[PDB]
Design a protein around this nucleic acid. Structure first.
Lengths: 116, 65, 88, 100, 271, 65
RNA sequence: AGGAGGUAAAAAUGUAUAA
RNA sequence: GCUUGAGUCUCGUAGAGGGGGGUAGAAUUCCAGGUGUAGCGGUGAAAUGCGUAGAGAUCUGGAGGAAUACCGGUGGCGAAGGCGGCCCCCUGGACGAAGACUGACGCUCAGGUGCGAAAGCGUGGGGAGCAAACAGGAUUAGAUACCCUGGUAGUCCACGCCGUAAACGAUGUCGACUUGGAGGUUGUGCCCUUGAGGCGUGGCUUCCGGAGCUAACGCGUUAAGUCGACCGCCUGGGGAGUA
């Protein structure tokens, strides 16, 4: 219901999965889907094919809102970063513009050291 | 020798926002001396100039605020 | 720092000539004004170790000149320090 | 007797009340023999990034010459005043003219 | 000055005494001095209500002016005096129209400074003005509660209240302990920070420094007999009951704050 | 950063982000403070740059290629 | 020609005499 | 006595040199509220942990603390340790120009005095993130380790103390001399700045190489070459820089 026209698809793609969230023009969420939520957890979860499928799982579940134009705002150094938006082109949507809002700290908190 | 200010010698002012626009990237970063080939004196001169203009909201810190 | 105005005053008081700005008399007097000027700076901060070295370096230079000046002009020497108030 | 280049923002509303603002500042400086040199009111200029609210602002450029005592007190009048936003104060370098 | 007293005798080994050479020596200002007979912790009924208070050197209460009901009249701080009633230091202050009253001494106060109270007073440590003309985010002490009551927050040695925000009719500030209380905007306050911050390091030393100040000995729970206190008894140092007060109330862990008529004011509790 | 290329774009057409930061800072700030290894690796990096300049000047040999 | 992203679980030991 | 040693003054230039006080934005975390729904987070694969009490994702607002992307460069500065947002106040050292002045005032330096990263310690504040200890889950023959979710002292500030490091160009300081090349940085002079130049003259600094030297590797006008002044230090390893 609610009949909204615009839509901002935030795509948080990290090194493990691609949680995708289609919000409204203001910020209120309107349904989402993830890599794992599609049904395949593990090594497969972090693949460009995962983000592909993620878009389809979120291609529907927004049909009640009948969104037309999008403002994709990708976020994160994930492997699904680039493949997810092309999945939205074929999904039958119109990307108005693409924006990148990756948090680039100006020497903020010290990062962890979790790897060797 | 792709300079600009090196010929037109002057103590670079932050007020010349048109001039400084050419030295910043569309994102808002400071283009390095390796690309513009600017003399190092005028580069550090430019750096303080930019940051002061940055402080006065004459230049963006980034694309999204 | 020793501002320029104060500098010309000191020279025109100890130098034998108006331009005589190299005499040992003058250099000792010159640095002494500076060291007294730095006591205010080292009364607040008391942690600024780098310019602490600046002060310490110029004290030894003052020390060496009086060593020199003594051994050469004994008479002149006692006159100088009583006009500048130091040594103890 | 330094030379300063005071630059400060003004919240739009008080922009309507800006001439009297400068008149008070230039009086204190002149009150202590401070020779003023520029008085370029940039006017209501749009900002780059929002300053807590306000997508619009008003600038005032000074380029004044004054003694250190006065300038320290005059800066405090920017601090405790809820009209002046971001006050910049730089150093001499042979005070200028026409600057823009 | 924080001076370590030299160990001449066993008893003066740990006396780190706070000496402040600026303190006025001699007799304090007579007209603002009234008696204060101690009561040793005994109410109208004569029974001991609050324990541990008794003895102590004879004190003399001094009328410290908190209300600060003078507007637009300058004042020249005369000198800094000592006052046994509190931890802070009071300052004999003289107004332009020849009148002497005491006030808490801010830390940026020297003998002979210039302060004034009122709405038109300039922002300077020692001035007293309402919480509507203070810049949001400064350091304030001697905060009032109701408009014209007098002042009851942060008046102890080295204490200051941060004014966090200001939401129109209310000024959300933050007490020293950690709570963020929301008080009436029209309440008067005093800028700066209460002096004598070395009071923290003042370690008593021998029992006397505690005893002649007023604190009587405290007798522990595991020492008293079971007929006198919920703890103790035993054949030899045997605790085992849950730590309680002498009247059967769970201590060391029980919230006891209950007014309800002020919860409308308490924004965030101490943590 | 940002891209619209108004009407006829139809493709991603944004590799210019690679030209700004996009991964170069994220894969750099994801962990490892080091505090002084970049000093080590930058001295190692510019050492390799001069290896090229040495090799550039050392290209003037036959080899029959 | 010049720069960026992505690529690697576990696996211990061998005494004491030869030019 | 003299001036080429050393030092002072006049005018300028560059600089993350040091101390003190303000301030801006980005990002993490937390708290309050809206939308919204089954996973999220994590790994080589997992699990502990978070999550139908409604997380993660997203947005509005607010609280805080620490660090200051890009500039940034074998780039600069300091005696060394070291020092990087921006602004002000206080202040040191270097370098150059063209003159003036003092007239050996110089070099080194046992003992002595001061400075001296990080860790640690005392007292008082602060505590986002990170993170010894430690707990839990994995991996493992076992894992008190690497890996993972959490997490304290500490990391931060103020005031004192500690005086060690591969505190390293493993090259003590100072002065003189002995072919070159490519740079970077910062001055300055001359000619037509006619035009991003042309030709010089100084400091600092990187790299490559000749003679020479070295056991060789390599060092090579900022020497480990050729000489001088002075000080520190070594005399097989282990025992031990310990009793």
């Amino acid at each position: 219901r609610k009949q909204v026209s615009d839509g901002v698809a935030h795509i948080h793609a990290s090194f493990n999965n691609t949680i995708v969230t289609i919000t409204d023009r203001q910020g209120n969420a309107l349904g989402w889907a993830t890599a794992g939520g599609s049904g395949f957890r593990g090594s497969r979860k972090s693949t460009p094919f995962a983000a592909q499928v993620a878009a389809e799982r979120c291609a529907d579940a927004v049909k009640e809102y009948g969104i037309k134009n999008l403002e994709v705002m990708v976020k994160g150094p994930g492997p699904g970063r680039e493949s997810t938006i092309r999945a939205l082109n074929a999904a039958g949507f119109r990307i108005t513009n693409i924006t990148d809002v990756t948090p680039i700290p100006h020497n903020g908190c010290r990062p962890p050291k979790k790897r060797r | 020798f792709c300079r600009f200010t090196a010929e037109g010698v002057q103590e670079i002012d932050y007020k010349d926002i048109a001039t400084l626009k050419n030295y910043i990237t569309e994102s808002g970063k400071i283009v390095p001396s390796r690309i513009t080939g600017t003399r190092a004196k005028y580069q550090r001169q430019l750096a303080r100039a930019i940051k002061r203009a940055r402080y006065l909201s004459l230049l963006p810190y980034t694309d999204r605020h | 720092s020793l501002s320029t105005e104060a500098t010309a005053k000191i020279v025109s008081e100890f130098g034998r000539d108006a331009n005589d700005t190299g005499s040992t008399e003058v250099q000792v007097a010159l640095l002494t004004a500076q060291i007294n000027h730095l006591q205010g700076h080292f009364a607040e901060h008391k942690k600024d170790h780098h310019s602490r070295r600046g002060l310490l370096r110029m004290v030894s230079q003052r020390r060496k000149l009086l060593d020199y000046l003594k051994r050469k002009d004994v008479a002149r020497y006692t006159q100088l320090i009583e006009r500048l108030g130091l040594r103890r | 007797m330094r030379h300063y280049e005071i630059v400060f923002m003004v919240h739009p509303d008080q922009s309507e009340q800006v001439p009297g603002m400068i008149e008070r500042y230039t009086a204190a400086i002149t009150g202590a023999e401070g020779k003023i040199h520029r008085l370029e009111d940039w006017g209501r200029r749009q900002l780059a990034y929002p300053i807590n609210k306000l997508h619009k602002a008003h600038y005032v450029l000074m380029n004044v010459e004054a003694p250190q005592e006065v300038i320290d007190e005059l800066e405090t009048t920017f601090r405790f005043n809820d009209a002046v936003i971001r006050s910049m104060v730089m150093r001499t370098k042979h005070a200028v003219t026409e600057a823009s | 000055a924080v001076v370590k007293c030299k160990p001449t005798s066993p008893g003066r080994r740990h006396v780190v005494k706070v000496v402040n050479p600026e303190l006025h020596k001699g007799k304090p200002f007579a007209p603002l001095l009234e008696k204060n007979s101690k009561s040793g912790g005994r109410n109208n009924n004569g029974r001991i209500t609050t324990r541990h208070i008794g003895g102590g050197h004879k004190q003399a209460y001094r009328i410290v002016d908190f209300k600060r009901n003078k507007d637009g009249i300058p004042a020249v701080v005369e000198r800094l005096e000592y006052d046994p009633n509190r931890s802070a230091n009071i300052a004999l202050v003289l107004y332009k129209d020849g009148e002497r009253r005491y006030i808490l001494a801010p830390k940026g106060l020297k003998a002979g400074d210039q302060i004034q109270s009122g709405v038109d007073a300039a922002i300077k440590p020692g001035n007293t003005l309402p919480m509507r003309n203070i810049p949001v985010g400064s350091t304030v002490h001697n905060v009032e509660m109701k408009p014209g009551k007098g002042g009851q927050l942060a008046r102890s040695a080295g204490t200051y209240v941060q004014i966090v925000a200001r939401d129109g009719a209310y000024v959300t500030l933050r007490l020293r302990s950690g709570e963020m209380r929301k008080v009436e905007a029209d309440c008067r306050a005093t800028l700066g920070e209460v002096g004598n911050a070395e009071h923290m390091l003042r370690v008593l030393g021998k029992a006397g420094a505690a005893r002649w100040r007023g604190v009587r000995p405290t007798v522990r729970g595991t020492a008293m007999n079971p007929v006198d206190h919920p703890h103790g008894g035993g054949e030899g140092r045997n605790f085992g009951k849950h730590p309680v007060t002498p009247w059967g109330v769970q201590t060391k862990g029980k919230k006891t704050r209950s007014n309800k008529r002020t919860d409308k004011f308490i924004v965030r509790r101490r943590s | 950063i940002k891209v619209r290329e108004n009407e006829p774009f139809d493709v991603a057409l944004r590799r210019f982000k690679r030209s700004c930061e996009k991964a170069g800072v994220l894969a750099e700030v994801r962990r490892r403070e080091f505090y002084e290894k970049p000093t080590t690796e930058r001295k190692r990096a510019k050492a390799s740059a001069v290896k090229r300049h040495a090799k550039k000047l050392a290209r003037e040999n036959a080899r029959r290629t």
